[PDB]
Symmetry: D3
Subunit: 250 residues, 6 copies
Amino acid sequence: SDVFHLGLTKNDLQGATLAIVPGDPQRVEKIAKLMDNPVHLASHREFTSWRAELDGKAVIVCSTGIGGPSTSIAVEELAQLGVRTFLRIGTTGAIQPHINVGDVLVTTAAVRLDGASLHFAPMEFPAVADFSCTTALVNAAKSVGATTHIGITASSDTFYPGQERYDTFSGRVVRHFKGSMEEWQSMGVMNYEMESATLLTMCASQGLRAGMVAGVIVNRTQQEIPNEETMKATESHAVKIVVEAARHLL
Amino acid sequence: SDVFHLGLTKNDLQGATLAIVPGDPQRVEKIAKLMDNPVHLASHREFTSWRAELDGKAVIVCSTGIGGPSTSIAVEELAQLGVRTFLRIGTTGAIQPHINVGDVLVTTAAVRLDGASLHFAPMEFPAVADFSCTTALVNAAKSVGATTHIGITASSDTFYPGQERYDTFSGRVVRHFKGSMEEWQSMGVMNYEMESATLLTMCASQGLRAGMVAGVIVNRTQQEIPNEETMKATESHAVKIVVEAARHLL
Amino acid sequence: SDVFHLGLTKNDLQGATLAIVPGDPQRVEKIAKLMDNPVHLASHREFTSWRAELDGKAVIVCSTGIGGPSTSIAVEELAQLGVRTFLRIGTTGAIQPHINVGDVLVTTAAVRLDGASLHFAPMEFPAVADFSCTTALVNAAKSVGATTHIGITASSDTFYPGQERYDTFSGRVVRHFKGSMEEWQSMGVMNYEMESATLLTMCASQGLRAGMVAGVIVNRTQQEIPNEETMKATESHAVKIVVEAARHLL
Amino acid sequence: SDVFHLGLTKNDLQGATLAIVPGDPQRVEKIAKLMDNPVHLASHREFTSWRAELDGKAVIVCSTGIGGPSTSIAVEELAQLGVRTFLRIGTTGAIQPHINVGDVLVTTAAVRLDGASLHFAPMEFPAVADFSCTTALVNAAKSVGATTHIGITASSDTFYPGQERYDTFSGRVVRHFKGSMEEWQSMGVMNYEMESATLLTMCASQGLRAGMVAGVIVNRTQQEIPNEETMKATESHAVKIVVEAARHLL
Amino acid sequence: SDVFHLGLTKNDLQGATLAIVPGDPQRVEKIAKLMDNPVHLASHREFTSWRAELDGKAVIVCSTGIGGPSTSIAVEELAQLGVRTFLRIGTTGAIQPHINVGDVLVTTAAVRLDGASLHFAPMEFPAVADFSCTTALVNAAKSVGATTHIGITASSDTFYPGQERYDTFSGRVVRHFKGSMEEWQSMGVMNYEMESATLLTMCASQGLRAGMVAGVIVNRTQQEIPNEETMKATESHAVKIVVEAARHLL
Amino acid sequence: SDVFHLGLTKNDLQGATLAIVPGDPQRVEKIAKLMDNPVHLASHREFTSWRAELDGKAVIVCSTGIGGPSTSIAVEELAQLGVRTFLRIGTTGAIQPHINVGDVLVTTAAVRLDGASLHFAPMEFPAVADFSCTTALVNAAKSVGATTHIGITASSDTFYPGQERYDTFSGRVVRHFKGSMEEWQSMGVMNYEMESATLLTMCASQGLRAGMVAGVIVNRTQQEIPNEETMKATESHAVKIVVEAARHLL
């Protein structure tokens, strides 16, 4: 296999420069159902990939799995495999009370709560999204009529403690990580996720544009229970936003 | 005076939710002059404000002085005085060979090396521009025909040792700052200035719209000293870009 | 599903206070097969669990994926699901010349370079194996005749830049990570893997028994590429060691 | 211009080795009204300077503007311009309740709350005042009969958050900076200011003596409202102390 | 003198590879009363040493005095003097309420609260005990029937503030060090001491095995007053454990 | 004994608000002998105190041992026992070529590289001498005709790796400490010792008067080994300076 994990060839990607980057393998095909001539390329470990075309040009939907490393490896290898533009799709909880379930997040830049981005840049270097990738997403979001928040999201190297989740075994979060929910909250930070800051940092540094969009399917800060359609209905909207935003990056 | 430093009051600002924030007192005046009904308001130390109109809307021009310390205050007191949108204008030089003299740079994000940025959010947190202002300033650079680069700018808390200048006659630069020139340069950063990472960070974590724009008066690797008929044109070029952008943010 | 990620419930685990935690979904199945009555339970993304018996006692095998982020979750949800004892099995390569191919490594402690370990305890705190599990795994390596080294393993939060790989096609590695290969090598560390410092640390500070074991598929300084009849034996060798150890921890 | 900012010549300073370093331009002339043959040298941005003579030798009063960078640049350039001894005059609030409005502070050393000093020394290196400069100030203070506190002052890279000022927009101070008022308070730290630690650090390192004195015109910790004469009356005392202390450094 | 402090010769140690390492000089002889042909070697400052034999081989009991530096120097010099295996004996308070006065602690690894270990390894490198040294102590502990806790202990560079002791002058502990008792407490950290992490780190790195055992003579967290026999009676048990554990390292 | 370590009570100190604090037990005795009515009080480990009179006023001499750990305790318990003024006396060597053998050094401030200083105040905070004690010790050095340098002394938490000694037979020194010899030397630091930054820092942040003084027994760059009739005179020289100073602090 030409790469390490992905196991893909320059024409196995069909020279595709742009990628769409969900974390989960069953969303890969999903996003790929929106674009023509799709093919599951490969699943090696969490590296399930598909390939379809957009406005006539070959594009790659590829799962990052969870976190900076499998996103790194993916992105690295995707970059090894010729990927210029990366677009991250997903769902999130809002840590900000002005924000609702069903809305759409466009992240301008991220908090580096990983160790993974610290690998591609000296930590002062911000985890930040390319302008043109961010512009597409906005332009794509408004056009399906989204409630669209543009802001910073927090990218954690751990689901629970880095996101200050007390519903785990410990009920404990390290001193360094305690109070950080409000710290990001009042700072205006829209949400939490694990992957971006790596993706953003490594794209920022390397001459590869990145951007990220998400539907808000839950609220870390809010009361009402969302209908079962929470994931599925909001995910359509944002998957469609990420594809259209992609169709405008070509 | 409703603030500790500037010397302004509220009726002074005359509405004016948007301020232009050049570094030096000297550049301040000229900026407002390009606008409508400029009036000198307050000159105190590094802090010099002017009031002027744009499409019937009051604008403030106010000097922020040298580096993040004096930067951080003016921003604070302008906002403290009711200004929600900040636009830094300036001139700089280009640590990336593709970036010319007479070049404009809009910054989405700043490398945070200045310690005055730290007083707001940790190095985990990105020093980020407001998407709406960045869009306004890019669409401005694009409206004036400017040759623009959009990316990261590095920010230091000292002209000399934080910008990695051994130009200082001590010629020292303590270890943490050593290597960053061709480091950031390989790493995508456009240029170096001491203010942005204090402001963008400050506005991002204060809930304010910030964006930045700069004329490149020198491309510093390339040994051509720019036209003896000077860098004064590239400042007069950038000062339109901020006024044009602002016009669209009103 | 009683946990956010895996897809497991309690009756699923069938008792089973002890889980085996390989990285990849693929190695998972085989492991449980060496045991009694294996049953595929849940395959979701990087998280794949199997249930199997040992001396009439239910064991879980569950994949943790790539690096500390995905690692940290599975561990969390397995424990969240009632598993107190964790045993990571894997294969690696040897940064110390005395360490061969076909070699086993039991880790007492991990160098914490991964940032996903940080979300639990500060770099002041050691990422430590459970003495009872380390004893079980050593007595196992000694029971299967394995040629073993016991010591520190280095852990990174990225395959490439945290493991000091300029193998990446960016080829970069920000300053904080530069030099560590022959650094750790002189400093006694056995090998490099991205998971242990997230788990051991996680279990040490969560009140859980953790230990780790690895087959060395490559000794990386010594330029001999290991037998073309492959590293598959050294994985089949180590997978006994974890099953043998576990047997003694029941 | 011979320097960068200051725009001064070796005899434009008249070879003056010693400087007096207020932050504000209108105090420059003030301090210069106490010494013979004064001349405003130059105001470029915040770099207003005067030159007079003391006991027969030419001396420089020069404004640092706000913060380490404009103090750096000044001091740097002053050092570039041949300045050995620096003496900082100013006013301050006490963060210590045993201290009164009207009293005089002599700072032995500073807390580095800037990023600016981190430019001239590796942070372990203390921000500390020369002994002989400090001795003059004491000796000068006692001789006008001052209530003279000798101690550490905190030097911040931001007026408000670094000094834990909640009376701003945010009402918020970063986690890292919260509780620090009392942290310095009970430690015995006399007061806050922005400039020194840079000045102290860069003088400590470079074979240039520094010292600092201040009148206390307000109390961050105390009740009673000071008369309008607070600034002016206390400023005389300390301006006179800084000149006399200077007259004893020759 | 052949070394620096210790002042010992290769046969003055009689080529002894193993050492026993109490902090206090009057425990040196004590531990040496359990092994044949003892001789006080030297007391230079806190470096009181004795030499006896164990199962026929010459061994060294040597005081480290207090802290990493005098332990370093000792250990360094002991290593300079040919010491491979180090075994630390002592007493401790439990910071964990599940633990009693009279019990025995075996430390697997330490928290680095010193600056001393940061000298022998880059802080990511854990302060960790050799397996075989730890195995002896367990095996030795059980055999006198000890109540034996195996776990992490916190190694501080200061008795009082690093251990969060409020019964001192200040009653104050630095922000960085406040709340750390519970931080280590709930993490499961068994106890506090000053010396180990240095000893552990420097042995971990250098091809020298280390381990540590202690009797619990007091509880930082508990009520009842222990009898006068607290030190003496519990110290016998653990001194005997450390000697027997030593007799099994040969 | 009113303190955990020393073995002293209050009537022991006989008043005596001022203690002299040499490192080693051996130098202790001689010091007090130069004073009036010396009496051996307590010898416990590194802690040895003596009581003696000066101009009818009781003084304490007490050993602090090796480095900041043992340092920090004695200081604590002496003060805990009622001593507000501390004077460290010692001998060292000179990292600056202008500094001789037979030279005295009074320290205003210490570079904080020792981690035992950190337990009091952050690296933001300077490790500062008490002006009144520094004055007393300078006026003392000047009273005995001593050739003195006044400036910064570097302080490490280990004799070898924190003082950048590869003299150690491991010969290692982890990256953070590498380069500091000619670093501090260019940067103005006078010498290197492991205690001051623990004490000065400790007294500064505890509200105590601290100052330090040292004889230079070796100028270490200059390859002249000092007089074979030894460094014993330069210690006998410095021991007057502390006793003379103290005399003026009573």
